[PDB]
Design a protein around this ligand. Structure first.
Ligand SMILES: C[S@](=O)c1ccc(-c2nc(-c3ccc(F)cc3)c(-c3ccncc3)[nH]2)cc1
Ligand SMILES: CCCCCCCCO[C@@H]1O[C@H](CO)[C@@H](O)[C@H](O)[C@H]1O
Length: 331
């Protein structure tokens, strides 16, 4: 067992092993930058807030640990280390998670810099590459947005912060369940649009405003799509908005690479069934400079059967603890 030391950082206490030095708060659970003495690399240590505060907190703690132990991909946050100061399950109430330090997110980029086309290519390519992997594990991210996309100085990108309204699929704003993975493709279209234009695609004030703005661009849904909305009040709202012409993305995005525009048109489609998939989008001509079908890996199958259970705080806590103890660091 490592030697642990104690420290106070922004009123929040930290008890970490000696290998981690120079702890510096970055955000607020709460995250610190630190120096990993073993590897000589800078890392992010995340202290979970109140991991076993409730059944919802305890299940969420287990969910995030399980998820992160499985994610092994260049464009997805992965676990370098996980630890607790606790000796025995009896003491267990703190979980620390460790990953490679990243430095900025995509919102710090927007922002800030004006992005040329090759940069938008590389960035969106990396999102879709991580997204292909995530989706291949039967995981929907659900919360893809600039602040959930960590980027270093090399413009290397990793997806984190697994599930604003600005990036949210319209079917999410409408409730609906049986979301497909392409809710994430919608968010990618919004992110891509913003990187191209320097402007939020759909900066809605509320869920209702968000829908109007979406409809202004992509047009009223056709009859085939309207028939699928059971909700009479959603149907009434939609059909009241006189009738939106589908704008020409070509005009809306004038100045952009026409291949960027074509891909966007395939991402920002109302019908979730008719949205391009992550794997399809990677073979789009827009990414010709980057696409290598032998270097776009898929994930081992991922067991989220636990999502079905209603367990006691103590049960979730014991399962989480088992995952801490069985952790095996990467090469
Ligand atoms: C959407 S919310 O603003 C939010 C944003 C980022 C994070 C966030 N969580 C982490 C983080 C750190 C360590 C882990 F093991 C797992 C996640 C980072 C991180 C990772 C690498 N380098 C710098 C920071 N950012 C949590 C919540
Ligand atoms: C702005 C209002 C337009 C409503 C968008 C509805 C289109 C979403 O697409 C719908 O998503 C569901 C998957 O969750 C599927 O069951 C439907 O087959 C699919 O058409």
């Amino acid at each position: 067992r490592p030697t642990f030391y104690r420290q106070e950082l922004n009123k929040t206490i930290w008890e970490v092993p000696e290998r981690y030095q120079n702890l510096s708060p970055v955000g607020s659970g709460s995250v610190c930058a630190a120096f990993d003495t073993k590897t000589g690399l800078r890392v992010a240590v995340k202290k979970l807030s109140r991991p076993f505060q409730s059944i919802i907190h305890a299940k969420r703690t287990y969910r995030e640990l399980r998820l992160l132990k499985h994610m092994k991909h260049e464009n997805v946050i992965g676990l370098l280390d996980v630890f607790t100061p606790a000796r025995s399950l009896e003491e267990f109430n703190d979980v620390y998670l460790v990953t490679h330090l990243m430095g900025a997110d995509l919102n710090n980029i927007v922002k800030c810099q004006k992005l040329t086309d090759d940069h938008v290519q590389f960035l969106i390519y990396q999102i879709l590459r991580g997204l292909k992997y995530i989706h291949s594990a039967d995981i929907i991210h659900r919360d893809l947005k600039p602040s959930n996309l960590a980027v270093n100085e090399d413009c290397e990108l990793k997806i984190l912060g697994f599930g604003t309204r600005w990036y949210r699929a319209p079917e999410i704003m409408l409730n609906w369940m049986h979301y497909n993975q392409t809710v994430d493709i919608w968010s990618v279209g919004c992110i891509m649009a913003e990187l191209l234009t320097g402007r939020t695609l759909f900066p809605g004030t509320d869920h209702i405003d968000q829908l109007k703005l979406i409809l202004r661009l992509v047009g009223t849904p056709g009859a085939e799509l309207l028939k699928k909305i059971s909700s009479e009040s959603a149907r009434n709202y939609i059909q009241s908005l006189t009738q939106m012409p589908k704008m020409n993305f070509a005009n809306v995005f004038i100045g952009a690479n026409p291949l960027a525009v074509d891909l966007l048109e395939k991402m920002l489609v109302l019908d979730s069934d008719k949205r391009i998939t992550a794997a399809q989008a990677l073979a789009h001509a827009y990414f010709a400079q980057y696409h290598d079908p032998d270097d776009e890996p898929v994930a081992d199958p991922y067991d989220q059967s636990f999502e079905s259970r209603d367990l006691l705080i103590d049960e979730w806590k014991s399962l989480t603890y088992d995952e801490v103890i069985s952790f095996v660091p990467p090469p």
